[PDB]
Amino acid sequence: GRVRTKTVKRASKVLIERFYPKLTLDFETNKRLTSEIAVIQSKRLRNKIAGYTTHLMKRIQKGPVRGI
Amino acid sequence: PVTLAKVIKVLGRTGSRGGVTQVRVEFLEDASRTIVRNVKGPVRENDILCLMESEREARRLR
Amino acid sequence: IHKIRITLTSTKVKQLENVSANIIRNAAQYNIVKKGPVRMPTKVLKITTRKTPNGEGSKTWDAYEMRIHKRVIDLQAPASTVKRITQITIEPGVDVEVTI
Amino acid sequence: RKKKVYTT
Amino acid sequence: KSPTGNEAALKNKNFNKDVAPPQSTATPFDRHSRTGKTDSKKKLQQGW
Amino acid sequence: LVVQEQGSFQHILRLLNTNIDGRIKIMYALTKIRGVGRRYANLVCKKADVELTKRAGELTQEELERIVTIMQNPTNYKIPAWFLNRQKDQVDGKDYHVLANNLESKLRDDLERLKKIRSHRGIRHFWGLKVRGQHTKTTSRG
Amino acid sequence: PGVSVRDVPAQDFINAYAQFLQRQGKLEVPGYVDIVKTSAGNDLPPQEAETWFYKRAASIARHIYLRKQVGVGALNKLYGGAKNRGFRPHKHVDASGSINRKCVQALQKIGVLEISPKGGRRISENGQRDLDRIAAQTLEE
Amino acid sequence: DKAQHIVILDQEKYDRILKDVPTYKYVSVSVLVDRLKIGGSLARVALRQLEEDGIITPVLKHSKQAIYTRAQ
Amino acid sequence: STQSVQTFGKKKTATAVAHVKAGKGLIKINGSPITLVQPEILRFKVYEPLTLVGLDKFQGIDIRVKVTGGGHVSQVYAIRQAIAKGLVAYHQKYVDEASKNELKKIFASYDKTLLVADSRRMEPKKFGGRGARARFQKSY
Amino acid sequence: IAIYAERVEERGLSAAVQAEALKAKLLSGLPIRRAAYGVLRFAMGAGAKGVEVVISGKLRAARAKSQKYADGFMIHSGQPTRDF
Amino acid sequence: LQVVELATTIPLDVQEAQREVKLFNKWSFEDVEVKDVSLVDYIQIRNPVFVSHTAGKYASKRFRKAQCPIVERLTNSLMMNGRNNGKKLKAVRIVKHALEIIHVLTEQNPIQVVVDAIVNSGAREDSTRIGSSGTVRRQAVDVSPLRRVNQAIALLTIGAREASFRNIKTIAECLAEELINAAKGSSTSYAIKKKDELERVAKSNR
RNA sequence: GCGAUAACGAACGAGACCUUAACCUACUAAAUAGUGCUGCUAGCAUUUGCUGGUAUAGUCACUUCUUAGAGGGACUAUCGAUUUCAAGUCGAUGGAAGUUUGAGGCAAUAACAGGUCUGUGAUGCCCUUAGACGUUCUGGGCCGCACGCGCGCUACACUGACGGAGCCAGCGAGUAUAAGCCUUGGCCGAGAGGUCUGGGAAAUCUUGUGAAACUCCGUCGUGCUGGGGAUAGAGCAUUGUAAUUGUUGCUCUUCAACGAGGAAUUCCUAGUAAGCGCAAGUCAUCAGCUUGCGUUGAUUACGUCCCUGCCCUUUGUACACACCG
């Protein structure tokens, strides 16, 4: 299974609730964005956050997401 | 007198040990007589598996 | 002119890299031709010691490591110039050997 | 686990 | 046959006539102390 | 190529009180003789110009009489001492290769000698156990 | 077209060079070839008594052509195989040095080999000349 | 121990091999042994002759097995 | 210099150093012709990048390969990829990409291993067994 | 050769210093409770993120036991144990 | 059609493959077809192959094995019984030589024959066991085409393997007898007797 | 984790993390790595080429394959589907990699009469401490077999034995006035082994560890056969102060059961299982053993609670030293 954990899930939504206009539906842009937005000590960790922040971003287009 | 039926939906796993499955077939010819049947082998949707005999429904296996 | 070989060994790369860089730094601004550093294949010191001081229970093994990093730098310079470079670029972890 | 004994 | 070397040449090996025992295993409350000196409620109060 | 013959074969062969299958390849066939390995019959046939593509039954009387001469006189046909069986004997000190009937004879003859000198090896020989120090605690169950 | 030793299949060439070698006859045969084993791990002498030394010599000459100053110590590891230890697992076993040391001695006096500096045994000027010759008269058939 | 294959070739068998093999579709090492009762040693040597004279057409060349047929 | 590209196809450990220059139809293995690569039963495997596009592409290019490492079967697969990548690499550098994309489709549709090295590798043996996942038979 | 004794700046932050000091206070006749929380507060006083003192063995009784005194934040698995 | 002249000369026979890829460059996959409607998807015969040694990743996903060439699924099925594990080349030596034997017998296409040996021996219904915790109980159900593809081959190789056990007959010639006979529904050969009993008991269990 | 929610927000563990493996024609450089050129040199058809040798000054060029530091890259990426349209899952195309990318290391709260006082100059106490249970020394014993059990192997044959021909890996180790290291290369030896030099305190030299399976070509040809290698007899070496109760090997010789194994039961889902060898260990010699590596390389699943085991909830209690109650 490819279930993300809570530590990546809560860090992803705190970004949207702070920098939604700077977020995009493209992972690459978010990958580079979260580097200068949040101090992430692990490169593997950084890609997981952006990959689910984009999924949260790619979800808001189909309608309102619950809890954010 | 062997008849062929294509599967159109898989319902779930059955049998005591889970090695058999309940799958919804649809006959190759005369797309009627919908019968739920069991398969010993792994099943994707759209399998053309044939039937030794047709006049029997299927249930959960003990 | 003299053909002089400098070898750098350690356990931790970061201090070895500073020594490796600083020597090149002393070999660059001073117009001294060099050849190196040559990253020697790492040497791991492996022993598979048994966890149990006794001999009871399941079999688990301890396999401890020693990653050793070696480089060689050939220097074409007088011995007076090369000797002072090492003291400029000293580190307790890194041992320095100089040979002509 | 034994008691030592001599002969000579 | 005073020395053991010389007598060895005569002793027979009578082993394959007698049946070895059919059962030969010879190598229970682990939870009960056999010391009989139980530590008091006061000792733990002083020890701990 | 395949050949044809009649009467030159010999169904029952006899070399030194020992019976050899005539229909089996000769350099393998001699192994029925005690004192013959597959190693030994390889060479005693070769220097006798017994081509390996033949059987025991094809060899005429002449060839058999020559090979048994080499068989019983190996040192006389430059067969090496390291290729012989009983090298540096106790009684005479001459290299020997004990054979069909005479192999077990010096085998027994060696037994009572160690039994005569009450050596530990012959002591264990009388019982019938292992003598080379091998272990009987769990395996000597036959 | 320039025929070389590397251009011809090895299995049939070694038969052809040995076929030339046996008819040549200038290579001297030790008298123990019908007595000795190829290696310490063998159980039977080679089944071709009349040819095996020539087949061995022809291959060894060809094998050395491909590599550089290979000594006789290297040759034993080339031909050795898995010994049939009775109950223990197989172990790699060296070849007989007496045969191999004689062959490099034998092929050196016939002009195919010589002692190379810093160890080993180089292939000679004419050894390449004859081997590449025998190769040239190999693949026309 | 029911083989009883014969490896020495007599006159009774040589001509029959010239009478048996030509009436075959495909032969192998066992085929000459299975029905002609000749040994495998006699089987492989017979095939190397039955082919050289032109009676047999070689289908495949191999050491551990041989595939042959009639040339008629 | 002359037209040359450097490539390499990789297998288990076999890494196949293939050199393609500008010359004749010289395709050699360690300086020896491809007509005598062993095992001969898989001599067809190293031919696959030759006959898939046709042998005429090898008229103007010469191929010399050197491979060390791997295993005997691993050698067969690595050289196959190296010359197949050598064909594509040479076409990329000196020929239009119309050819590089066109010929690659023939190579892509027949086997992905013709271009990309597979990642299947042996996994380390762990203590408690003779194999990577296998363990000593347990006694009750 | 030359040996130099350097005064450790933060005594509480050093496990070796505090483990040794506890050994003396353990031998000084103090009860374990008074001794253990004298270094537990000392570590938290120096600014340590966490501290765990485990005094195990037998004490005035035949059966032996283990006793633990954790304070602050404590990580257990992974590299940061080797790091922090 | 022209002979392509290379400096490193290309043999004449392999130059024929410039038209079509063939197994051993002797067997053509154009005239090979599956005579069973449901077994076409799980028998891959569309992509021609040179040698039954492809070394793909067919066990990674659930149904990747359906794309494996039909010839490789038998040579993989050959190397069993421990000592033969990893002896794929030898198993291909068994398959290739057998196909040489297979063509001279019945005069049919060797790779068409093996497909027929796979469709005929596939049991369609098996009586699975439905024991209620220990007792002997059986229930008859169907068999999927994927299993009906794979069960026939494993039966086919087993009948090949025992035919050569303590037997002067070699494995390849046993296989050729095995494959052509089980292709025609021969009750004498293996993978028919073991199949027929499987469907026999399934009737009395439904 | 979604969700439901008298809970809300958090922490440890899991996951993260780290080591290793994969990709990088993009960097940094590589005479302890190689290649193409360049000399000088060779054999063949002479086609200017095909193969090689050499070159610590050809005082050649480069890092691409080999090494390793700096980095980069994947985050289920994008799409079709089902789902509480959520968490997710399943199929495609791209990709080097889409099973947590692969495999491992560290790893929670308390605890067990689990194992070790035979590792300690770690121990409290009992015993003993000069005719010592301390030491030292010689000789023996742990090997000793009427028997049952297991961890392995040798195989039970032709998918094979021998005999030739071919001939590829990777992980590792190796020294001085010693107490003798890896040992090449040469010379003697059927073999084992013996002699003389030299390299290497190490990507150089040992060692391309040319490992075996394997491919080919031959004999064998169903026979307990030439499958198998017990039990035993004779000589030559090695090691050690010392090999008898064979250290071991080697040479010859002896030519065993075993012809696939009952009731039962074990490991395992991909380079994994299983064949096949190699190195490090204890070691002066002794590997059928472990530890690691590499070669070949599959069958079938991708589901369930039927067995077993564990966990959670409900339930019951006269147990709490907790059913060994």
- CA-wise closest residue to I51 among K48, K195, F94, G76: K48
Strand order in the sheet with C67-76: C34-44, C67-76, C3-10, C95-99
Those residues of chain G whose CB sits closer than 8 Å to some CB in chain F are: 34-35, 43-45, 47, 49
Residues with Cβ within 8 Å of residue G131, at least 6 apart in sequence: G5, G17, G61, G62, G65, G112, G123
| Strand-strand pairing, C47-50 and C61-64 | antiparallel
Residue I60 touches chain K, beta carbons under 8 Å: no
- In whole angstroms, what is the distance from residue F41 CA to residue F39 CA? 6
Place of tokens 């393609």: I20
C-alpha to C-alpha distance for F69 and F76, rounded to whole angstroms: 9
- Name the residue of chain F whose CA is nearest to H9's CA: F4
Alpha helices (runs of H) in K140-170, residue ranges in sequence order: 145-163
Structure determination technique employed? cryo-EM
Answer yes or no: are the C-beta atoms of C20 and C10 closer than 8 Å.
no
Query: CA I127, C1' L151: Å apart?
Result: 15
Question: Is K203 an 8 Å CB contact of chain H?
Answer: no
DSSP-derived secondary structure for E24-43: ------TTS-SS--PPPHHH
Structure tokens at J22: 């506890």
Q: Are G64 and G128 in contact (CB under 8 A)?
A: no
Q: Does I128 touch chain C (CB under 8 A)?
A: yes
From the CB coordinates, do chains C and F have 3 or more pairs under 8 Å? no
Q: Are G124 and G112 in contact (CB under 8 A)?
A: yes
Looking at chain J, the number of H-run helices and the number of E-run strands are 3, 2
B48: which 2 tokens?
Answer: 């053309």
| Nucleotide nearest residue I118, measured CA to C1' | L96
- Which residues share a beta bridge with C8? C71, C96
The alpha carbon dihedral of K7, K8, K12, K16 has a sign of negative
Query: Residue J71 corresponds to which amino acid?
Result: D
E interface test, pick of F115, F123, F124 with most E CB neighbours within 10 Å: F123
Reference K173, options H30, H38, H70; nearest CA is H30
Under 8 Å between Cβ of B48 and K37: yes
Q: Quick check: F4 and H49 CB within 8 A?
A: no
Indicate the resolution in Å: 2.6
Interface test with B, best of K141, K198, K200 (most B CBs within 10 A): K141
Report the nucleotide nearest the CA of residue I73, measured to C1': L296
End-to-end CA, chain B: 29
- Rounded CA separation K119/K32 (Å): 13
Q: Is A37 helix (H, G, I), strand (E, B) or coil?
A: helix
Query: Which candidate in J60, J65, J66, J67 is best for mutational testing of the E interface (most E CBs within 10 A)?
Result: J60
Which of the nucleotides lies closest to G88 (Cα–C1')?
A: L288
CB proximity list for G25: less than 8 A, separation 6 or greater: none
3-state secondary structure of J50: strand
Give the whole-angstrom CA distance, residue I48 versus residue A38. Answer: 51
Task: Report how far apart, in Å, the C-alpha atoms of G32 and of each of A13, G51, I72 are.
Answer: 88, 14, 36
| CA distance linking residue K182 with residue I57, whole number of Å | 45
Residue recorded with tokens 């007198």 = B1
Give the three-class secondary structure for H10: coil
Would you say K51 and I45 are in contact if contact means Cβ atoms under 8 Å apart?
A: yes
Record the tokens describing residue H30, joined without a space.
Answer: 């066992």
Type of residue numbered E41: K
CA-CA-CA-CA torsion sign (F112, F117, F122, F127): positive
For residue H26, what are the CA distances in angstroms to B18, H30, I37, K180, K188? 49, 11, 32, 14, 20
User: Could you give the maximum distance between any two Cα atoms of chain C, in Å?
Assistant: 66
Q: Which H or E run contains F14?
A: strand F12-14
Residues H30/H68, Cβ–Cβ less than 8 Å: no
Interatomic CA distance for residues K70 and K183, integer angstroms: 15
Which residue is associated with the tokens 């040239």? G136
Residue written as token pair 């031919």: I47
CA C3 to C1' L37 (Å) is 27
User: H39-47: long-range contacts (C-beta < 8 A, 24 or more apart)?
Assistant: H39/H5, H39/H6, H39/H7, H40/H5, H40/K168, H41/H7, H42/F2, H42/H5, H42/H6, H42/H7, H42/H9, H45/F1, H45/F2, H46/F2, H46/H17
Asked if residue G39 keeps its beta carbon closer than 7 A to nucleic acid strand L, the reply is yes
Provide the H-helix boundaries in K7-144: 72-78, 88-104, 110-119
Q: Do G9 and I36 touch (CB under 8 A)?
A: yes
Angle between helices G97-109 and G52-66 (to 10 degrees): 70
Dihedral pair phi/psi, residue C26, rounded to 5°: -75, -20
Q: What is the DSSP letter of I104?
A: H
Sheet strands (E) in I25-140? 27-29, 32-33, 61-68
Q: What is the distance between the alpha carbons of residues I64 and I84, in angstroms, rounded to a whole number?
A: 13
Q: Residue length, chain E?
A: 48
Flag residues 9-68 of C with CB < 7 Å from strand L.
13-14, 17, 35-46, 48, 52-54, 56-57, 59, 61-63, 65, 67
